[PDB]
Scaffold this active site. Structure first.
Site, PDB file in Angstrom:
ATOM      1  N   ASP A 114       0.841  -1.194   0.000  1.00 46.74           N
ATOM      2  CA  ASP A 114       0.000   0.000   0.000  1.00 46.74           C
ATOM      3  C   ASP A 114       0.878   1.246   0.000  1.00 46.74           C
ATOM      4  O   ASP A 114       1.348   1.665   1.057  1.00 46.74           O
ATOM      5  CB  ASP A 114      -0.914  -0.009   1.220  1.00 46.74           C
ATOM      6  CG  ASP A 114      -1.843   1.192   1.266  1.00 46.74           C
ATOM      7  OD1 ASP A 114      -1.939   1.894   0.235  1.00 46.74           O
ATOM      8  OD2 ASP A 114      -2.474   1.408   2.330  1.00 46.74           O
ATOM      9  N   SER A 164      -0.538  15.557 -12.151  1.00 48.26           N
ATOM     10  CA  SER A 164      -0.756  15.199 -13.545  1.00 48.26           C
ATOM     11  C   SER A 164      -0.993  16.457 -14.377  1.00 48.26           C
ATOM     12  O   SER A 164      -1.525  17.456 -13.894  1.00 48.26           O
ATOM     13  CB  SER A 164      -1.957  14.252 -13.651  1.00 48.26           C
ATOM     14  OG  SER A 164      -2.310  13.977 -14.995  1.00 48.26           O
TER      15      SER A 164
END
Length: 330
Positions: free
Chosen positions: A35, A199
């Site tokens: 994770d 992004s």
């Protein structure tokens, strides 16, 4: 040193991935959920409330000659999906894919919430975010990657998750045969303890690319792709019959649909998520309403590049003094 371990989807939807981890002496092998959105290595154990164990493999510290109680240390964690666990702490030897760390904090669960009990395939979590998020008190503990870093050939790990197939976590090296083209690196902020990056935009299907900054986290422990409501609406508007359902808890779409791809930007590069990766199947057994793999982050407070996005790429988690993220097509 290096390590290399195969990671395997837990079910036919790629809801999560499990990776075998050796703990203790002699080794006890547990299948952990790696994770990159959390920083605790915790396991089902001989200390876990018996009624909360249902098929998981347990770590028994009393059977490990290298286990030592970390006296006074406790831990307690709550995840973004509402699940939680807590307990006490041992140090022990932990190996992943041939890479060994001695003195790793192994957090032994005394209590786990229902969603953990109900998932017999996940024996615990191995956190790979920054150690500043580790919950052990009163002495915060380091992640497996943080403990291994100095010994690694290069201070990196990579995630190469499969679509409906096994993939690989590598530590300490970049397998240049595992991706196509070049790796595009992008800046990371560690201010929230996550692999947080920006992004450069998105496209839906064959549509034109929209240049827009989207701050989010690279999170292998989250199944889906959570993005701003504007982006998610633009995606689902291209699927006939798709709608957001408050009763189901997100966007659903007709199971008869063919889904468009979704592209996200990494600098000037582009990662394309095929439409099939966005199909999470019937909302309930036999239903013709299917659950979407791109969902709004509006209720979360952060955008999350979960498995839906990450499995479309070869992803480098660069833990150099200034951390960065790398993405390549594959």
């Amino acid at each position: 040193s290096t390590g290399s371990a195969t990671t395997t989807p837990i079910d036919s939807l790629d809801d999560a991935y499990i990776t075998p981890v050796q703990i203790g002496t002699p080794a006890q092998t547990l299948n952990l959920d790696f994770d990159t959105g959390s920083s605790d290595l915790w396991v089902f154990s001989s200390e876990t409330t018996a009624s909360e164990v249902d098929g998981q493999t347990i770590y028994t510290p009393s059977k490990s000659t290298t286990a030592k109680l970390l006296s006074g240390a406790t831990w307690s964690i709550s995840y973004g999906d509402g699940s939680s666990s807590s307990g006490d702490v041992y140090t022990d030897t932990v190996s992943v894919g041939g890479l060994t760390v001695t003195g790793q904090a192994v957090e032994s669960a005394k209590k786990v919430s229902s969603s953990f009990t109900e998932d017999s395939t996940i024996d615990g979590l191995l956190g790979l975010a920054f150690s500043t998020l580790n919950t052990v008190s009163p002495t915060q503990q380091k992640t497996f990657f943080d403990n291994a870093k100095a010994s690694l050939d290069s201070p990196v790990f990579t995630a190469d998750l499969g679509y409906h197939a096994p993939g690989t976590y590598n530590f300490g090296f970049i397998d240049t045969t595992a991706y196509t083209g070049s790796i595009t690196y992008t800046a990371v902020s560690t201010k929230q303890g996550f692999w947080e990056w920006t992004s450069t935009g998105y496209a839906v299907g064959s549509g034109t690319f929209k240049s827009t900054s989207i701050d989010g986290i690279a999170d292998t422990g989250t199944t889906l792709l959570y993005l701003p409501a504007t982006v998610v609406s633009a995606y689902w508007a291209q699927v006939s019959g798709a709608k957001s359902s408050s009763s189901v808890g997100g966007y659903v779409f007709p199971c008869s649909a063919t889904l468009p791809s979704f592209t996200f930007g990494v600098g000037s590069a582009r990662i394309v998520i095929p439409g099939d990766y966005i199909d999470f199947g019937p909302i309930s057994t036999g239903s013709s309403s299917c659950f979407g793999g791109i969902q709004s982050s509006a209720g979360i407070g952060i955008n999350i590049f979960g498995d839906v996005a990450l499995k479309a790429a070869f992803v480098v988690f660069n833990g150099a003094t200034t951390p960065t993220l790398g993405f390549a097509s594959k």
